Write a protein that binds this ligand. Structure first.
Ligand code: HEM
Ligand code: HEM
Ligand SMILES: CC(C)(C)OC(=O)N[C@H](CSC[C@@H](Nc1ccccc1)C(=O)NCc1cccnc1)Cc1ccccc1
Ligand SMILES: CC(C)(C)OC(=O)N[C@H](CSC[C@@H](Nc1ccccc1)C(=O)NCc1cccnc1)Cc1ccccc1
Lengths: 439, 439
């Protein structure tokens, strides 16, 4: 390279192979690679995704500098992603000024008031979620959580943002490590693939929407995007935000729900202690409300501690858009700065027994011993997760309604312990199946 | 180029643009381009798909030389197709020796005896095809032919080759001009896309089968591929033939059926004259049989004359694998030789009133005035359509059973006349909808 950079900076790290960089080390997944490098190299280290240098940082102050103090000036954008096509205008993917604009356009969607307007609406699909669960529990047949969870998550996302109601067991649309591997050795092929219309998003899954958002409709977040469009928001740019929002609210929601239900099943005392709180705040199986959801502290602790063990983003990243010297360390233009959330969430130098599910970690007696720059399931700074309050609410409303009616036990075919997918993303190897018993 | 070749051979043709070749001329579709060049240039002409020279030939003798006399020696293979992936081992796509082998392996599937074994089996889905039609005709609601036709075509293909029965209105699997355009200017990008696993066949449609043929099953054409495997046939090569066969039997069958039913609807005398023959050969709505299907001469004439107007392959092609001088014309190595079937099927120098639907053209009084090297809906020579006798049978069995119960009239929203898709393939612009009346 270009494989001399960290050598030259005196920054330690795994020796890269030509072209490949360190990427063969991903044979155990991002997260094990990160954990290993943390323990081998300490607070800071560098590696190469192909020819791209990545600096991992683990100092809280330095992380606050990157995500917060110097965001607009230096660390505004994430690693180039391609080929994306018209999805370049998607907010999680857009850069500099354009992202600032979309962030401004879309921010007022998750105010405490717009959220609070959605609790009445969400309250309907929880009842479908239960009734669907009530059938596969009267029939003692183990249940695939992500199926009925994603169906619920799908139902919430299409109607909180657009207005479309579907009982996701008609199986309505749904979209979807062989190839992104070739990206990292061949990032030069991204501009190639762009001119080919080639997309990591199959052109058919997007064409299903390239009209279906125009096919919505029309005369909620979709409302809020024309009402704020009234330098304003295009319509192929509006479709792009819709795609982001539908994915995020479907996949992350369903998947974190599956993780929580696994933890409750292998820790029955935590499941019961939570069911008792729900019944004390919502007695007679009372319907949750925006304000009772926010009152349940143990539900929050359970949500948080699961997100400690399964930070589904895994890593946070920012591109260095110019030479800087943050907290005494020189960082050259073009380096990707990465925060290894999975690794920091499991660091024994911050967390007692860091692999155990222990929600007391987030008790108000203990929540202050926790550095918001070590615990980052939603990122931080101006580019943190815009859907955070919606996600926590949506999940908690789901959990409340579900633990109000059912208990969850392991099955013969439950994977205990749970292996993580040694692949690209943060999911289990085998899917989560548990016995569901009616209260 | 390389854009001097035809200039140098004294062969006439449209002047190519740099890089693009003649490809902007496709703005009206292959078929109009071919027809135009035929009338402008005569019997032989050349053009460039990007930098690739294509020689069109229209002399019957020369066409017989190419497709028949010199097939194994010179004109064994079709234009390189990519990126294909494991689909390179598919018979329509494979080359030289390997194609010879697969052609030998797979040929005995459509013997008159293996076909005859399938008439009993096919006879079941025709009855589903009718009963499905009987519902949308008791409800005077116009019908989309290709929907119920493809459902039938799907049902026939999965069970004639594997053994799987599905009432294709549960909507069972089904797989599927933006990008192949970039191929022709960038064929150099094909080896690029191969190393990227990138496929013109979405990796998910094939993964749905990359196991589903292994998921078939196992302890018919699928039978005949292990029984002949017993230099033998692999299993990822077996999947590849399955994919070819499922497509061909689904899409071509459904689409030619739609074309025939359009012609019968806009020519009611032909529809009646056919219904009379079916009732004379199969009286009391008798079930068709292998031998009665072959007896109906007007049904054959109707099938043939539709295939004259809609040759769904459009063009036949062979790569020149070495310098030759066929019928007095020198052809250099690497040129694609193309036979413009659509253009020859509509040549007024061979066909009276060539745009009219006139099935008498194929009467036994007139069928001999027709050059099998001008009329080529199934290609010709050792690389002709291997599924021809199956296709004609399958369609004719469908037509018999359907015209035995229903008549077909135009609708308010029937496109008359029918526009062809000015796009890539030979399909109508709008889909075919007709009124269906119960006899
Ligand atoms: C449990 C659920 C979720 C988790 C753990 C999560 C986590 C994250 C993380 C870690 C980031 C990157 C933050 C950073 O770089 O500092 C992010 C960004 C983002 N998230 Fe989420 N997320 C969740 C659900 C959602 C939902 C439901 C939406 C709804 C639209 C959403 C929308 C976004 C967007 C648009 C971004 C990019 C923000 C920007 O660049 O301005 N997320 N999320
Ligand atoms: C109305 C229906 C069909 C029409 C008009 C049609 C037409 C054609 C044509 C024009 C060719 C190229 C011949 C050449 O280059 O000389 C071809 C090849 C082929 N057809 Fe069909 N076809 C039909 C249905 C089918 C079906 C149902 C199958 C079932 C598997 C099939 C299998 C194939 C294969 C495998 C090839 C490549 C043959 C080889 O290279 O050895 N076709 N077809
Ligand atoms: C393993 C998971 C998936 C859990 O995580 C990731 O691997 N991470 C993503 C990789 S896909 C980029 C894009 N997906 C997309 C998906 C479909 C059609 C177009 C686009 C995205 O931005 N999605 C929003 C999001 C996802 C998750 C949480 N919240 C918000 C990168 C990313 C994550 C978070 C914020 C920004 C970017
Ligand atoms: C407009 C139409 C489609 C009617 O026609 C074409 O454009 N023609 C094809 C282009 S796709 C090559 C491949 N499809 C495929 C489709 C899906 C998964 C993998 C592969 C093929 O070979 N199919 C068999 C076939 C199709 C039609 C008739 N009979 C047999 C080229 C071709 C045609 C005929 C023989 C060989 C090659």
């Amino acid at each position: 390279h270009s494989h001399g950079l960290f050598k030259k900076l005196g920054i330690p790290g795994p020796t890269p192979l030509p072209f490949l960089g360190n990427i063969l080390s991903y044979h155990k997944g991002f997260c094990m690679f990160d954990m290993e490098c943390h323990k081998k190299y300490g607070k800071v280290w560098g590696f190469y995704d192909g020819q791209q240098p990545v600096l991992a940082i683990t100092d809280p102050d330095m992380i606050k500098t990157v995500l917060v103090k110097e965001c607009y000036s230096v660390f505004t954008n994430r690693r180039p992603f391609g080929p994306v096509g018209f999805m370049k205008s998607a907010i999680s993917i857009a850069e500099d000024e354009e992202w600032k604009r979309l962030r401004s356009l879309l921010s007022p969607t998750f105010t405490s008031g717009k959220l609070k307007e959605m609790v009445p609406i969400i309250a309907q699909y929880g009842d479908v979620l239960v009734r669907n669960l009530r059938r596969e529990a009267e029939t003692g047949k183990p249940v695939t959580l992500k199926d009925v969870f994603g169906a619920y998550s799908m139902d919430v996302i299409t109607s909180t943002s657009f207005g479309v109601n579907i009982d996701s067991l008609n199986n309505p649309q749904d979209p979807f490590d062989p190839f992104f591997l070739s990206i990292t050795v061949f990032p030069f092929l991204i501009p190639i693939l762009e001119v080919l219309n080639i997309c990591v998003f199959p052109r058919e899954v997007t064409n299903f929407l390239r009209k279906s958002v125009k096919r919505m409709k029309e005369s909620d977040f979709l409302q809020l995007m024309i009402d704020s469009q009234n330098k304003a928001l295009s319509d192929l740019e509006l479709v792009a935000q819709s795609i982001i929002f539908i994915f995020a609210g479907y996949e992350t929601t369903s998947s974190v729900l599956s993780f929580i239900m696994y933890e409750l099943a292998t820790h029955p005392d935590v499941q019961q202690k939570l069911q008792e709180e729900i019944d004390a705040v919502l007695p007679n199986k009372a319907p949750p409300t925006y304000d009772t959801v926010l009152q349940m502290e143990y539900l929050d602790m359970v949500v948080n501690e699961t997100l400690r063990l399964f930070p589904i983003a895994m890593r946070l990243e920012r591109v260095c858009k110019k030479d800087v010297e943050i907290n005494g360390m020189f960082i050259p233009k073009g380096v990707v700065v990465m925060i290894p959330s999975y690794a920091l969430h499991r660091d024994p130098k911050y967390w007692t027994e860091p692999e155990k599910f222990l929600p007391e970690r987030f008790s108000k007696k203990n929540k202050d011993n926790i550095d918001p720059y070590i615990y980052t399931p939603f990122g931080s700074g101006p580019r943190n997760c815009i859907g955070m309050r919606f996600a926590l609410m949506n999940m908690k409303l789901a959990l409340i309604r579900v633990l109000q009616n059912f208990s969850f036990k392991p099955c013969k075919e439950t994977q205990i312990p749970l292996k993580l997918s040694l692949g690209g993303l943060l999911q289990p190897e085998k899917p989560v199946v548990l016995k569901v018993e009616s209260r």
